[PDB]
Design an enzyme around this catalytic site. Structure first.
Site, short mmCIF file in Angstrom:
data_model
loop_
_atom_site.label_atom_id
_atom_site.label_comp_id
_atom_site.label_asym_id
_atom_site.label_seq_id
_atom_site.Cartn_x
_atom_site.Cartn_y
_atom_site.Cartn_z
N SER A 130 -3.75 12.73 -15.82
CA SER A 130 -5.07 12.62 -16.44
C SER A 130 -5.38 13.87 -17.26
O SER A 130 -4.93 14.96 -16.90
CB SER A 130 -6.15 12.45 -15.37
OG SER A 130 -7.45 12.64 -15.91
N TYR A 168 -10.68 14.28 -7.44
CA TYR A 168 -9.82 13.39 -8.21
C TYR A 168 -8.96 14.19 -9.18
O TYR A 168 -7.73 14.05 -9.20
CB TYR A 168 -10.66 12.35 -8.95
CG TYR A 168 -9.83 11.57 -9.93
CD1 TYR A 168 -9.05 10.50 -9.51
CD2 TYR A 168 -9.80 11.91 -11.28
CE1 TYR A 168 -8.27 9.79 -10.40
CE2 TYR A 168 -9.02 11.22 -12.17
CZ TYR A 168 -8.26 10.16 -11.73
OH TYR A 168 -7.49 9.46 -12.62
N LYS A 183 -4.60 14.94 -9.77
CA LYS A 183 -3.82 14.78 -10.99
C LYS A 183 -3.16 16.09 -11.39
O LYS A 183 -2.09 16.08 -12.00
CB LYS A 183 -4.70 14.22 -12.09
CG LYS A 183 -5.21 12.80 -11.79
CD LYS A 183 -4.06 11.86 -11.44
CE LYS A 183 -4.50 10.40 -11.31
NZ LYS A 183 -3.34 9.45 -11.17
N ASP A 216 0.88 -1.17 0.00
CA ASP A 216 0.00 0.00 0.00
C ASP A 216 0.92 1.22 0.00
O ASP A 216 1.48 1.58 1.03
CB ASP A 216 -0.93 -0.03 1.21
CG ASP A 216 -1.85 1.18 1.29
OD1 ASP A 216 -1.72 2.13 0.49
OD2 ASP A 216 -2.73 1.18 2.18
N1 LIG Z 1 -9.11 4.25 -16.44
C1 LIG Z 1 -9.33 5.68 -16.80
O1 LIG Z 1 -10.28 5.98 -17.44
C2 LIG Z 1 -8.33 6.77 -16.34
C3 LIG Z 1 -7.31 6.46 -15.21
N2 LIG Z 1 -6.30 7.44 -14.81
C4 LIG Z 1 -5.24 7.06 -13.86
O2 LIG Z 1 -4.41 5.87 -14.52
C5 LIG Z 1 -3.83 5.22 -13.54
C6 LIG Z 1 -4.16 3.69 -13.68
O3 LIG Z 1 -5.55 3.55 -13.44
P1 LIG Z 1 -6.43 2.29 -14.18
O4 LIG Z 1 -5.51 1.34 -14.83
O5 LIG Z 1 -7.45 2.84 -15.14
O6 LIG Z 1 -7.28 1.63 -12.97
P2 LIG Z 1 -7.06 0.14 -12.30
O7 LIG Z 1 -7.96 0.12 -11.08
O8 LIG Z 1 -7.41 -0.94 -13.32
O9 LIG Z 1 -5.48 -0.01 -11.82
C7 LIG Z 1 -5.08 0.75 -10.70
C8 LIG Z 1 -4.19 -0.21 -9.82
O10 LIG Z 1 -3.50 0.68 -8.73
C9 LIG Z 1 -3.70 -0.12 -7.42
N3 LIG Z 1 -3.89 0.80 -6.27
C10 LIG Z 1 -4.79 1.67 -5.82
N4 LIG Z 1 -4.35 2.16 -4.66
C11 LIG Z 1 -3.17 1.58 -4.39
C12 LIG Z 1 -2.31 1.76 -3.31
N5 LIG Z 1 -2.12 2.50 -2.01
N6 LIG Z 1 -1.17 1.08 -3.26
C13 LIG Z 1 -0.86 0.21 -4.27
N7 LIG Z 1 -1.70 0.04 -5.34
C14 LIG Z 1 -2.86 0.73 -5.39
C15 LIG Z 1 -4.82 -0.72 -7.59
O11 LIG Z 1 -4.94 -1.94 -6.82
C16 LIG Z 1 -4.93 -1.06 -9.24
O12 LIG Z 1 -4.51 -2.45 -9.50
C17 LIG Z 1 -4.44 5.78 -12.26
O13 LIG Z 1 -3.56 6.65 -11.65
C18 LIG Z 1 -5.68 6.55 -12.76
O14 LIG Z 1 -6.06 7.57 -11.73
C19 LIG Z 1 -6.33 8.79 -15.38
C20 LIG Z 1 -7.55 9.25 -16.20
C21 LIG Z 1 -8.37 8.17 -16.99
#
Ligand SMILES: NC(=O)C1=CN([C@@H]2O[C@H](COP(=O)(O)OP(=O)(O)OC[C@H]3O[C@@H](n4cnc5c(N)ncnc54)[C@H](O)[C@@H]3O)[C@@H](O)[C@H]2O)C=CC1
Length: 244
Positions: free
Chosen positions: A142, A155, A159, A58
């Site tokens: 983002s 959120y 970013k 975490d």
């Molecule tokens: N999916 C979308 O539409 C968009 C996502 N983002 C950003 O892209 C990045 C990746 O997100 P996604 O792949 O879409 O979502 P996702 O949920 O599929 O992957 C995010 C991963 O980060 C892990 N996570 C969350 N908090 C954590 C913590 N303290 N410690 C360790 N791991 C943690 C999660 O377990 C997850 O596996 C994020 O930063 C998200 O905010 C930016 C804008 C668009």
């Protein structure tokens, strides 16, 4: 291209992070899969193979970050690339309805976690840069950081923090041979997409489709490669034109 490099990717147990871990490994990199989701981290690491190490952590907690860095250095001897990709959000809603407990958790992951992981690795990166080995920090922000739409206020502001800290670290760390860059993805086909929410999103992207993890991974691979050795401090929109 990334041959010989070691990349630590937070949040690589799912979504964009999973795509980047897979793409980097295909490029010859060793990858440290850091995620709070132990099952996702282990699945990704096992799908990649011996070049991947799964680390459950975490990143909002200092002890977990210390342990994840120590594990990465013990396994692979060095870290060349840090990808700050872990993040959480809130459901779209009026800003004044997000209560302090949820606000604080979002800051903990998207802000404090980036601070902790980056601060813990900067001394190692500086050592590497002093040896002529360039290091890269890539932060996933983002399009909402600078081009927000209503109902994701807190959120999006985290970013904006990420884009800002990218610039500030880039100018400070460039003489140490450490580049610091950011990607601004638009809505992507990841498990988190249903939280920020499909035809409505698709039609708002001029290129006409949602972002796929493979799209973002290619831009990440380019920016983290020696072919980008003069690129630092930028936030590159990968968004089908949404931010125009
Ligand atoms: N999916 C979308 O539409 C968009 C996502 N983002 C950003 O892209 C990045 C990746 O997100 P996604 O792949 O879409 O979502 P996702 O949920 O599929 O992957 C995010 C991963 O980060 C892990 N996570 C969350 N908090 C954590 C913590 N303290 N410690 C360790 N791991 C943690 C999660 O377990 C997850 O596996 C994020 O930063 C998200 O905010 C930016 C804008 C668009």
């Amino acid at each position: 291209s990334l041959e010989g490099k070691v990349a630590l990717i937070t949040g690589a147990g799912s979504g964009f992070g999973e795509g980047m871990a897979k793409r980097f490994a295909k490029g010859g990199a060793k990858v440290v899969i850091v995620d709070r989701d132990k099952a996702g981290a282990e699945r990704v690491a096992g799908e990649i193979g011996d070049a991947a190490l799964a680390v459950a952590a975490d990143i909002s907690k200092e002890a977990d970050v210390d342990a994840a860095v120590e594990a990465a250095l013990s396994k692979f001897g060095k870290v060349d690339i840090l990808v700050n990709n872990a993040g959480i959000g809130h459901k779209p809603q009026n800003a004044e309805l997000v209560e302090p407990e949820e606000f604080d958790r979002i800051v903990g992951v998207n802000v404090r976690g980036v601070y902790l992981m980056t601060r813990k690795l900067i001394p190692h990166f500086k050592e590497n840069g002093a040896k002529g080995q360039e290091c890269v920090i890539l932060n996933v922000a983002s399009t909402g950081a600078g081009r927000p739409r209503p109902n994701l206020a807190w959120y999006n502001a985290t970013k904006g923090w990420v884009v800002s800290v990218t610039k500030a670290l880039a100018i400070e760390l460039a003489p140490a041979k450490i580049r610091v860059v950011a990607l601004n993805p638009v809505a992507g086909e990841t498990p988190l997409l249903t939280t920020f929410m499909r035809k409505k999103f698709r039609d708002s992207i001029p290129m006409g489709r949602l972002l796929k993890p493979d799209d973002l991974a290619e831009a990440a691979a380019f920016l983290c490669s020696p072919q980008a050795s003069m690129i630092t401090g930028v936030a590159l929109d990968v968004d089908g034109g949404r931010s125009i």
